[PDB]
Write an enzyme that holds these catalytic residues in place. Structure first.
Site, PDB file in Angstrom:
ATOM      1  N   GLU A   1       0.779  -1.243   0.000  1.00 48.23           N
ATOM      2  CA  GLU A   1       0.000   0.000   0.000  1.00 48.23           C
ATOM      3  C   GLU A   1       0.814   1.298   0.000  1.00 48.23           C
ATOM      4  O   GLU A   1       0.272   2.373  -0.280  1.00 48.23           O
ATOM      5  CB  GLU A   1      -0.987   0.029   1.183  1.00 48.23           C
ATOM      6  CG  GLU A   1      -1.976  -1.133   1.224  1.00 48.23           C
ATOM      7  CD  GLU A   1      -2.895  -1.157   0.020  1.00 48.23           C
ATOM      8  OE1 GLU A   1      -3.034  -0.099  -0.657  1.00 48.23           O
ATOM      9  OE2 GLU A   1      -3.484  -2.242  -0.247  1.00 48.23           O
TER      10      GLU A   1
ATOM     11  N   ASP B   1      -7.028   5.508  -5.530  1.00 51.79           N
ATOM     12  CA  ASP B   1      -6.518   4.135  -5.660  1.00 51.79           C
ATOM     13  C   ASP B   1      -6.548   3.675  -7.107  1.00 51.79           C
ATOM     14  O   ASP B   1      -6.834   4.461  -8.014  1.00 51.79           O
ATOM     15  CB  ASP B   1      -7.231   3.109  -4.738  1.00 51.79           C
ATOM     16  CG  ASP B   1      -8.691   2.793  -5.162  1.00 51.79           C
ATOM     17  OD1 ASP B   1      -9.063   2.926  -6.353  1.00 51.79           O
ATOM     18  OD2 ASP B   1      -9.478   2.365  -4.283  1.00 51.79           O
TER      19      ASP B   1
END
Ligand SMILES: Nc1ncnc2c1ncn2[C@@H]1O[C@H](COP(=O)(O)OP(=O)(O)OP(=O)(O)O)[C@@H](O)[C@H]1O
Ligand SMILES: Nc1ncnc2c1ncn2[C@@H]1O[C@H](COP(=O)(O)OP(=O)(O)OP(=O)(O)O)[C@@H](O)[C@H]1O
Length: 483
Positions: free
Chosen positions: A85, A94
């Site tokens: 991440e 994202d």
């Protein structure tokens, strides 16, 4: 079972090594080594060899540095996701286009940035203005990991699988429910079945085919192998990937094979040797069954040479006080042999610390004043040429010695061998007999190694015919000769 009838000097040194161990004089671990590099000594305490167990390799399973890591078990879920991440202190989108922050924290699927910004203040407890701190991102992170663990344990399709998994796979499944959430991973019911039945090569395939993976394959492929191999190897060195995974010892030994065949004689003799020493790093299990002591570990055993300093140490001196012409010409000839070794085996790591210099009417040749030892060869024999040559260059290319055209002496030594296809064939068979002995050997991986090696020879042959410098040699575009 250590025997080398072909090399009784080597065997004799090995026998002193074992005997010295029997007498409780243990190979001592080099500091400023890999944790997995050792000084083998004989019964008189002198250093006869350098030993590098396979399993203590940097990618090695029993490597001391990564042992702390393997204990955490699932607790590696944190680092695992930090790696996948990354970290951001400000709102970003994202992969799917959704507003995200900190470490993988999804704020909303809404297109509105103030939905997200609003949603962010709720979470943090203040007006963030879309920007949070390190501690704040860390606090979201724990809660999101708990939420995943909760998502798994509150769920009927997921829980059963999770309970049947080893500490590491569990971590992989959490990884998934972190990215896709509870409900999403439970639509995988097939792969959960395989995972559930323990068939790893089964499931590793079906996850290879998903809407997931498709979006973020680079990440997806990283778990799948964490599922398949039950290990952290995809989160260790992501990536070197120019090289086969845990075969460094074989590089070491292999480098010495090539030196032998080309008759360079710069590589202190190195073979595959088995040793057992209490000073090594063993599983607790093994330690216990010894009470029938420690098992022998398989590793590279490289003879130790005296009177040498760092290439760096000497070249620094020769620059301030240049060698007389005749000695200096002996250096260049030792240097050409190094370039030939490194070009042929495609060394990815050779610095000025990685090779050593020693500077001191008849039937006999007067001894040479200068001499070159090529050490630390476990980083060669790549699966393919490195993507950015600047990351894994040939360091010696920027040395002035690399400017000087190849000597007739080297062409004479080397061209007759590498021009003989039966030499190159024999050389490849010898490498095969060495490399195939590794439990993790792969015939397909091997062919690629040979392809690179065959492409390097292709270039070197023509470099040598043209009397090119070492430098001009490396500027030749890398090739592979593929079957
Ligand atoms: N065959 C040898 N003979 C004499 N001295 C050696 C030999 N091999 C290594 N040494 C010395 O020991 C050191 C060991 O370095 P080496 O790089 O081989 O191990 P390592 O440090 O585990 O590898 P890395 O540096 O990639 O971690 C060298 O710098 C050199 O000074
Ligand atoms: N130190 C080195 N190690 C390995 N290869 C080198 C080294 N220096 C140069 N080369 C090779 O020589 C070639 C010379 O290219 P150079 O970088 O001098 O100009 P370039 O065209 O800018 O290279 P590129 O654009 O491909 O980066 C490169 O393709 C590279 O393959």
């Amino acid at each position: 079972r250590n025997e080398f009838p072909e090399d009784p000097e080597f065997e004799a040194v090995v026998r002193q090594a074992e005997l010295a161990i029997e007498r409780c004089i243990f190979p001592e671990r080099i500091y400023q080594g890999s944790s997995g590099s050792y000084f083998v000594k004989d019964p008189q305490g002198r250093i006869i060899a350098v030993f590098k167990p396979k399993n203590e390799e940097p990618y090695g399973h029993l490597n001391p540095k990564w042992t702390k890591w393997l204990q955490k078990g699932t607790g590696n879920i944190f680092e695992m996701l930090r790696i996948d991440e990354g970290l951001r202190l400000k709102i970003y989108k994202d992969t799917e286009g959704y507003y995200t922050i900190g470490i993988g924290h999804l704020l909303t699927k809404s297109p509105s940035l103030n939905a997200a910004k609003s949603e962010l203040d709720k979470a943090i407890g203040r007006n963030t203005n879309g920007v949070i701190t390190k501690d704040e991102a860390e606090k979201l992170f724990n809660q999101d990991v708990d939420a995943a663990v909760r998502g798994i344990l509150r769920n009927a399709k997921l829980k059963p699988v999770y309970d049947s998994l080893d500490a590491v796979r569990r971590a992989a499944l959490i990884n998934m429910v972190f990215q896709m959430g509870e409900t999403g991973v439970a639509g995988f019911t097939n792969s959960l079945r395989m995972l559930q039945q323990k068939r790893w090569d089964e499931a590793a395939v079906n996850l290879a085919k998903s809407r997931w993976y498709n979006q973020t394959p680079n990440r997806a492929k990283r778990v799948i192998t964490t599922f398949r191999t039950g290990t952290w190897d995809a989160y260790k060195n992501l990536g070197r990937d120019c090289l086969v995974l845990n075969q460094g010892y074989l590089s070491e030994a292999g480098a010495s094979l090539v030196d032998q065949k080309l008759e360079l004689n710069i590589v202190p003799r190195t073979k595959v040797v088995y040793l057992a020493s209490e000073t090594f790093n063993y599983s607790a299990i093994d330690r216990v069954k010894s009470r029938i002591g420690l098992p022998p570990k398989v590793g590279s055993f490289q003879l130790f040479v005296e009177g040498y300093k760092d290439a760096d140490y000497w070249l620094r001196r020769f620059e301030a006080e240049p060698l007389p012409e005749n000695t200096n010409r002996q250096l260049l000839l030792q240097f050409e042999r190094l370039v030939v070794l490194d070009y042929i085996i495609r060394n990815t790591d050779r610095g000025n610390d990685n090779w050593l210099i020693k500077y001191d009417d008849w039937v006999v040749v007067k001894e040479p004043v200068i001499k070159v030892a090529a050490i630390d060869n476990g980083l060669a024999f790549p699966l393919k040429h490195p993507d950015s040559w600047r990351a894994y260059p040939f360091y010696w290319a920027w040395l002035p010695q690399a400017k000087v055209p190849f000597s007739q002496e080297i062409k004479d030594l080397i061209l007759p061998k590498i021009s003989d296809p039966n030499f190159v064939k024999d050389l490849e068979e010898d490498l095969y007999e060495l490399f195939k002995k590794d439990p993790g050997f792969d015939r397909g991986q091997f062919h690629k190694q040979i392809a690179v090696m065959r492409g390097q020879i292709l270039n070197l042959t023509q470099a040598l015919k043209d009397n090119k410098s070492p430098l001009h040699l490396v500027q030749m575009p890398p090739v592979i000769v593929e079957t």
